[PDB]
Amino acid sequence: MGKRMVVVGGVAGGASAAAKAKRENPELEVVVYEKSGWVSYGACGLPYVLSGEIPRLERLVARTPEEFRKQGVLVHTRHEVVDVDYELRTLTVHDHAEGRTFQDRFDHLVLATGARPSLPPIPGTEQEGVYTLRTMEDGERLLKALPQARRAAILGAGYIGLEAAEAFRKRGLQVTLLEAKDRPLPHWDPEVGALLKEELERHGVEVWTGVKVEAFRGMGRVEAVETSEGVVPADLVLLATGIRPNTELAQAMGVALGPTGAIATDERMRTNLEGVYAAGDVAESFHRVLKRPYWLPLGDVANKHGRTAGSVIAGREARFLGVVGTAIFKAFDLAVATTGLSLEGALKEGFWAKKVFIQSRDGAHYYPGSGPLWVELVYEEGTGRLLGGAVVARGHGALRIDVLAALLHREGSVEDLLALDLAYAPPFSPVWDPLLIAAQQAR
Template sequence: MRPQRLVVVGGVAGGMSAAAKAKRQNPALEVTVFERNAYISYGACGLPYATSGVVPNLQRLIARTPAAMRARGVDVRVRHEVTEVDGERRCVKGRNLETGEAFCAPYDALVLATGALPVCPQVPGRALPGVHVMRRLEDAAALREAIAAGATRAVVVGGGYIGLEMVEALVTAGLDVRVLERQAGLLLPFGPKPAELALEEVTARAEVVLAAELLGFEGRGRLERVVTSAGTFPADVALVAVGVRPNNALARALGLRLGPAEAVLTDAQLRTDRDGVFAVGDLTAAHHRVTGRPAWIPLGDTANRQGRVAGTVIGGGDARFRGIVGTAITKVFERAFATTGLTLAEAQRHGLSARETQITTTDHASYYPGHRPLHVTLVWEEGTGRLLGGQLVGYGDAVKRIDVLAALLFRQGTLQDLADLDFAYAPPFSNVWDPLAVAANAALG
């Protein structure tokens, strides 16, 4: 029986995609979205650039407003927090954060899109004014206000790609920046060569302190110092970017089956193991097409695709989410870094007989003005030649070649498939042998 009432808990990418698609699929469906924050749909990946001022107005990041969604027949209620799901009676309960009024909303189908929460180490002083995270539009607004109020010294805790994007943002905004990382390198999930080049890129513009354990934040009334195992550093603002975790409180209370990182497990239609309950976005683990196992890799484009599938199914259509290969891209000052599939270390941890090939070439013909270096890493399975992953480091759009590798990984392509591709060529864009083909041929021998 097709549902008549859909409740979505959480907006932004996954939740709003599910709500909008379900309503388009079945215009008679009653759709209600509850979002505890003030904004329902915005470009979260643009937050560092809005913080720096490269995007001058935070409002430019907003993709959909509650009024626009209501005009499409979707009832959006912001500043409404769902605190309980009654799976037996099929209703959600919560409160209006503006008025304190309680609410109870029945559903036939429920989409959990509660996303992820930033991890903040449980250290002294973490609640001091001046200690920030970067997850919501409000977080970027708060950091912009601190900069406008005269902050000049910043400490970024965490050397992953969000942390490094924020290092660039704060340097661009004119602050003196120090980045602290507890491990021995920056951008380590992208592999050794990207990590080496990321460290080179950042140390040219900010101080980097590696193998530093965060011990606490200090200050009289607001942040003044960041205390670590490597010393104490002055700071007007600190940005904690040490990772996120699934916001799974409602899922756990419902007894939903959990997987890696305690993310919710679903089938290909985003159904959970509870009848009528779907889950999408950063809350969920997804089928990894390289390893064949569930993986938790929270990314906005995954959330959007999952939301569209769930909305199609709830609206009466047929759709499948076919999985991920873990493709990501980031800009760190002048260089761009991209990864897909597995690094060599990850492949070996999964028990695969993996090998790695690395080349450095130019992003277009060396005789054409403006060519710059492009580093390519291919990870592949010994014996079969199956591609397992790849990483690119270069400048500008040259690293978008990662999408070629992602497409081949999605179809379980091989080194020979990559070498055989009919790449576009003109001197301003590539060499006569595309860098990916050069790497594939080097691996083939």
Template sequence: MSERLVVIGGDAAGMSAASAARRGRGPEELEIVAFERGNHTSYSACGIPYFVGKDVADAGSLIARTPEEFSRKHQIDARTGHEVCSIDLDRRAVLVRDLKAGSEAWEGFDQLMIGTGATPARPSLPGIDAEGIYGVQTLDDGLALRAALEKHPRRAVIVGAGYIGLELAEAMCASGLEVTVVGRGEGPMLPALDADMAGLVTDAVRSFGMTMLLGESVTGFETHDGRVSAVLTGQRSIPADVVVLGLGVLPNTALALDAGIRLGPSGAIAVDGRMRTSAEGVWAAGDCVEKFHRISRRAVRLPLGTYANKEGRTAGINIGGGYATFPGVVGTAAMKICSTEVARTGLGEPEARDAGFEPVSAVVESTTRAGYYPGARPIRTKLIAERGSGRLLGAQIVGEEGAAKRIDVLSVALWHGTTVEELINMDLAYAPPFSPLWDPVLIAARKAWDKVAAIR
């Protein structure tokens, strides 16, 4: 007998699940309907800063698949402009509002996949609803911001010095605006980076001609005729024609919570390894669920597109009658601001302490290619290891072109519980255009091992 899968959310997690479920079960076995409240399905949210900064000319190129493609190629009925307002587990139905028509209807399901994602934090500060203040989460947000830049604003203020904030700072800078980044913490990208590595990012951002204000909280916005004119912090007023909010995101859990589905200790939806929620036949994946961190061994919220896709695929394989598990994360992430590349994986020093480890760390400066080879760029690599065992706990990289993706070596090593001693002899590729003879990662491992092995 045919079943019906309802998917809430038409982005990475939801549509990955839908596609994987379809691979497992054909249309005669499984009807799939996906509801997306926005106007687009399956687009690269991570690409929005590059669309805003015009590295990517056309918003269409960020869209992996349109609803028409899902329908035609996969027999998946993806309905944009439809918001799910409620889940009724007893009736096995969701209440769906057609945002254009303004009508509501109950849609029944046998299996339910929750991919509601996360929403950017938007603190209730005076003036926050003024014109000229942009969040950047959806493609529509990106379109609005890029349209605003066509009016040649002069000064941009980025509120928040995390990944998205810095990527948007690059986009604003590339568009010729004077850019000020305001961050609450003592460095950018905390706690993803340790303070010493964050300091390198601060130096880089300033060297690109941007202003970076740290340890300042935004208290409100000055407005003029309903438009933002300045950003206020405890210390100053920063004139602004455009403001972009990059304050992180919060998981969209209300629908699940209201339906009685269990949240985990991190505050996101709790799932098992197969992406099942606490409710029978209800699955969840992506930014709205918590993940198991393989190093801290805790449930964490880490809203990254790679996890959403992998988790969605896992849920979909299971919904489609297969078997798959998602084995957790080690917290790998990377970003670029202008010519500076930043990457991290595992735990930073404070995070390691917080998780009960006694960390030692080593930082080395090297180059991305053999020092004598054209295009060799600086790379600074930090490794964090456990004193006593020498087990690798985390790594951070700040450098220039060719630096960031080296973090993957450390991610895979972390995944396997490798010690920095073992890492020293790992068989990494060498040729002068690609690396110094001793890869920076291996030099860092040598230095970290010397520290691990030393008497305090």
């Protein structure tokens, strides 16, 4: 057929779906309504623009609405879809331009509305030098503030935020990191959190742990941040305290939410409504270690959602088979990569789990320049089944984390990892690869 595919949200989930659908079946009428007035850009690259290493913000955009148009996709920015006459039963889309508002119909709907920052209930948040890092607009705002230092406070030591702290330092500001839990990257076992505190401090960043941020002092400007632990002075504060999915429009139309709070889907990215798909940070994925639905808002998983929904719609056979949790980020001179479960969470889940954490090198002892490389394995006591792992390196990189993700995918044991024929040469790994030395193999 030659029906009409309407995508709500044009960032990554949505742009993927739109592009793949149109390519796979050009008969389709493909239209994207994006509320933010930018479409198809790399939010992940924001801290590299902030820091100054990337010259202009437009460098993050993958496809422009003009290029899309050339490829038969119609994108409208600053268009918000406000209601859907679902089932119910189509019309459905009423959305809003500049000036007007209006109706449109759909045969296939892709809900790709993403996620918004989850702010903690703190008096003072509303003031003037308080910021959030999620969109190109947040990028513009912060980029305007940044020159004209001087003192920054970042609430939250997760990904945005560890990443932000590096950006701010490279811009001259003095930066103090306030985390509510007891280490940076609280979400993982604490050997990694340690290495990270050390690097952050090595670079001039002050890291407060166990902090109860009480309020942001000022008369609508902000100059302070009063905490249980004292008072941090600050003329720019970044709230980097987590995200939650944008499921609001979807609930209105009667799309089901899964246990995590994100929209539920199948291997086909289909929601509980015929005709309605979901993709990207709004959508749950199946976790292959935990064997249940799980929320993993990364950009690679949003592209995979997109591409599947799009393929399915254009009537190609395509399925999305889950995730395992692989993540990697850069904080100064560390590249930190986790996958699967940490030992904390593997015990919360009930496994009789143990960990091993070793430090090795990233090249032969004798090779000039070789740095350190640490690798953690989280496994089941008796079976030896892998359940998670980390590696941290300076490397561009390592990234050997991908081997563990491959093993997590099938069931995969420490014994399987041991048997692997990995690559060795003096510039790139010691003759026993850190993955192999970690395996069983040392403590």
